[PDB]
Amino acid sequence: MRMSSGNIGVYKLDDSRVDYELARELYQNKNANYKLGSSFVRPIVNSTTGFMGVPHFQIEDEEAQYILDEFVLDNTSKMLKTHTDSLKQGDCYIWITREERENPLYPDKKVRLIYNFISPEEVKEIILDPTTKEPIAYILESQNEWTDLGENKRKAKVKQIITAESRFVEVEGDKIEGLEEGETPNVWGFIPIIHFKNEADETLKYGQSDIEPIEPLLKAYHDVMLHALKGSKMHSTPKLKLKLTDVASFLAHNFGVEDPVKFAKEGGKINLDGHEILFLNKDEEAEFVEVKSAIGDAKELLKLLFYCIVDVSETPEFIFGVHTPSALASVKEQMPIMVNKIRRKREQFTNSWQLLARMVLIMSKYSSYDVTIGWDEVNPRDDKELAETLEKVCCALDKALEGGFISEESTVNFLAQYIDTMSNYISDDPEREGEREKIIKTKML
Amino acid sequence: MRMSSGNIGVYKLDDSRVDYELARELYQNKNANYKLGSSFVRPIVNSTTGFMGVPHFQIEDEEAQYILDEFVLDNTSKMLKTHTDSLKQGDCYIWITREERENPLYPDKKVRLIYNFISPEEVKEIILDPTTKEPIAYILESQNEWTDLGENKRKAKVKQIITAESRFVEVEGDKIEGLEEGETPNVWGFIPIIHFKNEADETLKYGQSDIEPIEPLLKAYHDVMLHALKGSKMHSTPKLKLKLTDVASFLAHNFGVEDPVKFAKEGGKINLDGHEILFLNKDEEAEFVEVKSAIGDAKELLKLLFYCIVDVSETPEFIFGVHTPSALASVKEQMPIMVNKIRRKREQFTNSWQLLARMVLIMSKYSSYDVTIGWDEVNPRDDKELAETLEKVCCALDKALEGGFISEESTVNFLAQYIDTMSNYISDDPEREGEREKIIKTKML
Amino acid sequence: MRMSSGNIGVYKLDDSRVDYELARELYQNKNANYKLGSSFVRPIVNSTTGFMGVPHFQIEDEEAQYILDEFVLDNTSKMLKTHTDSLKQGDCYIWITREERENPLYPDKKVRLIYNFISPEEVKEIILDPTTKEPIAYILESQNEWTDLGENKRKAKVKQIITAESRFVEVEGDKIEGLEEGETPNVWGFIPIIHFKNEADETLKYGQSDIEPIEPLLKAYHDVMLHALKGSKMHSTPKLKLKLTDVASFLAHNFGVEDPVKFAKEGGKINLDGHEILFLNKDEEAEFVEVKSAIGDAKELLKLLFYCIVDVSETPEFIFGVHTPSALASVKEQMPIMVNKIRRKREQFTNSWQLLARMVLIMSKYSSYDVTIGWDEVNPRDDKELAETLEKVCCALDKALEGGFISEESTVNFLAQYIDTMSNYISDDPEREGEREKIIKTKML
């Protein structure tokens, strides 16, 4: 709606968070208030995170490219889990750490960069620069309950302040060997934590889960489903109604129920087999008390709520094709809608991935530290069609020779793109296959 | 839902575990509280585990590649079983052991690496490093009840601590010949156990079964089915109602029931056939007491619960095409949904497979220990189309010769991928055929 | 479905068995409690065992390959029956024995390896190594009732211990000429028995039948069908109702039933031809007492149970296309589902087949004893398409000659694959046709 120019309050940033425990419960269908309704959460989040894939780090420096290739080779699955965590929870925090420990399971890697997840509950507070809004300190806090290599239980409340100039850590409880209390300097002068913020908003400090828009619809769907289930349980089975001359005599004679009041008080049950025949007198009557529909219009309301859920999440209908088998007729026809959604969604994380690649390069000189994020194919391209258009361009070239030698400039780029498309396996997330194939080719020659 | 920045509890890792016995019972349709509902568990789990196949270990060192080829040749089926176990139970544990025993059944393989399964119930406790969160000890425990080669029954409670520096085993009860009590050194400085964690989450210590999201839906489906079945058994067959002048005399004359009270008390049955004729008085009446529908709306509710189950598991609709025969048509059209699900699912295990391959290589010097995991094709490629695009690329090359000799770098990689696509049989799990074809070629030359 | 870390009992191996007699009765539709329900057992097991075919033993040693070719030539049908038995019963035991007896029916084969089945009931107990869980003794027991070549009946209770170091046999009854009583040495120091274990689980000593998951559904289907059939038999035929002024006089005049009580006591029947005309007085009435539906909703419940059975067994819908004729229209479209199921199923037996081939090779020096298990085509390939892509390979090669002489390496492997896929007849189980074609080529030259 509209409003006058005045009569509007001062802008204030929101520090509210996503209630990550509830989001995880909805994702796993565990919350009792959403069990019948939260069935839609998993397909939405998982289809969205599967179709967007993982970033493909691209940089023009050969050494930086090699470092990023090694990093993705190590942590492509962790990147995909970062995507699905950000979608489910709204916030996901990635901590890059460098460990020089020597252990015999990794004799080939003296120094390793670790892709550590900080659970969003651990981040008690983020201290932002009031002007530039970038973080200047992360207040992590966790309750570590663990067991010693002996038989002793252990507990410790660890809070650690992570800042660009140093990191402080103090534990309130049992000793932890790997963490040294007190302040220790931070080797690089930046915070090595990356905040992944799904559905980031300029008026919000933290991200938003993809479940948040649909959550009231899930609640309504659960309520309608539960009401329908209870109504059917109570009334779907018709009730036999016997209008008897003497109810007590009939019960005593036919079921041995001598005291029906006590029989009802104790919840007694009359056993029936189905193949019964009724011998009544003239005045008595037997009839079934039956409902035309114990559910009423709950089916239509659930269909409307399903439509609203699909609209809000913007899920293409083939994801929910069991509801609407028409969508399964042509997935390729609907795939542009998925491409549009994934295009919109990938931009919410590419800046974070550029920051992560920049920090990885710094934490391990290079002519450039900027990275461009490539991506997996949402709608896979036909390699045969690519070769067809390649040969068509080639035969178009080498004719009307006044055009100059930019034919080489065009064809080298086309060949590079063709190799990228061909070597990247459609059904395998990331581009580890292409990197390892290049490495094997370099080794074998 | 949202919440304020404050008023949030401290993060704590969850040590809860999947009820493995219940998970197996649901998988095998054995639990009486889920028999009519747990019919969906098997298609979900088995379609997911069969479409993802088994990993293809790739490494640039030829010795490491040969070792991994031998390992997959020996233990490819156990890896598919590991996938199935991780999906069904949430947790699967693989113990790699090296055995030098000489037995006549293996005259050649003097030394063997054994792919042993630790049942998830055996793992009494996992001791984690409080900082790095990696396991530093595994507390295994099992009750071994067995028969001696004579006639004697044997029972022994064995618990063994498996640590990176040594392994300790103590057995209470009868002697076990193959296990030596007390501590013995660990020849390898790392724990040789691999923890396969399905649906791993940063806030969880153990994996989640694929049955957990659908379990309440399975329970509701079972309840609705059982209620419908009981209602139909009670009321589907219509009941003949006779309004007689005198019931007792009618029963005595027509069925010889001289004492109807005792007849009902003992549960006597009146034998009848379909062909009958009723001779009644003018005042008497005979009628059938019948239900329009003994089930009511349970069919619609079961349809809704089936939709919820299919949505939660994200199973493509052709898996349950008997419910929806439209889904059976155009399975290739629905394959991208399966491809997406398998893409997302394979990343929960690839890191564990990298660890397993690394440990196998260390257990059996190599220039590298990093293994890249390939995979079976979900939507198999057409060999003829690969040949066509190979020809198109080839004729595109050898023209506009200013491009240089990088055409070798593209065509050799394409030929490698091409031979990989051919030698790997689509219908056969893993790549045993591709490895042994090369081995037979090397032998025969 | 979750549980806390503690409050879990110790792991114990389960030695329950599959009730093989009941499984065979269900397979043969012989159990009276499953006759109307067990109709689905045969198509499930037989489709699964027929589409998976038999193993193709591949080894790189020419002599070992020849030995395995002879073995499969002898025992391909027994191998397929082993698959069927493992699926039906859960357990199948194969005993490889070597006999040097001279008989005139086999003058060409002085020494033969016999593929003997041990019925799973014969195996009283399997003694396992408590640590490695490999069997160390098989306790076989059978009641041999037979006839002498004369007129005498014979009965003997034979139990034999089969161990790696020796085999013991004792007979409690009549003499058996072929079994020398007492202990005898084992020529090879391994047990010559192979245990085929369908649906093997780490927590189960024995295998599981494919009937076990569906058995409660079969029981429910039988119960619903039997209730429906009895209800229809009782009530489908409408009952003629005559409201008469005097029933006894009517019966006496129209049917000669002078004493209706004695007529009803003896179960007398009134003969009717269908073409009757009723002459009544004004006060009397005649009407048919008829049911709208004697079955009620049993049809819908049976459809639901059929869907559950198809889901549990994971049978592709074209196997039960009589229920759903839509499936039959697109069998080729559904073949990927069958391929997935069969690919998953084959891995449960391939280790046993590798062990069997290894034992066969040992029981008859070789450079290698490891065998790779090939398989029949589930979705058969088109030979013309294979030749087409071969031509595409050939024209792609011999161009851009810097690639080297690995064209030979690729093309020889593809020619071998083409010969394999061409000579192996699709409609004939196994590869005996290709083996004898090669043998005839060698003989005739």
Author numbering:
A (entry chain K), B (entry chain L), C (entry chain A): 19 to 382, 389 to 469
Paper text:
The virion can be divided into five distinct regions: the head, neck, tail, baseplate, and needle. Structures of purified φCD508 virions in both extended and contracted conformations were determined by single-particle EM of frozen-hydrated samples; the resolution ranged from 2.6 to 4.0 Å for the extended phage, and 2.9 to 4.2 Å for the contracted form.
At the base of the capsid sits a unique opening, centered on what would be a fivefold symmetry axis in a complete icosahedron; it is made up of 12 copies of portal protein gp45, forming an opening through which DNA is ejected from the capsid. Thus, there is a 5–12-fold symmetry mismatch between the capsid and the portal. (J) CryoEM density of C1 portal/capsid assembly showing the symmetry mismatch between the pentamer capsid vertex and the dodecameric portal. DNA density shown in yellow does not form interactions with any portal proteins.
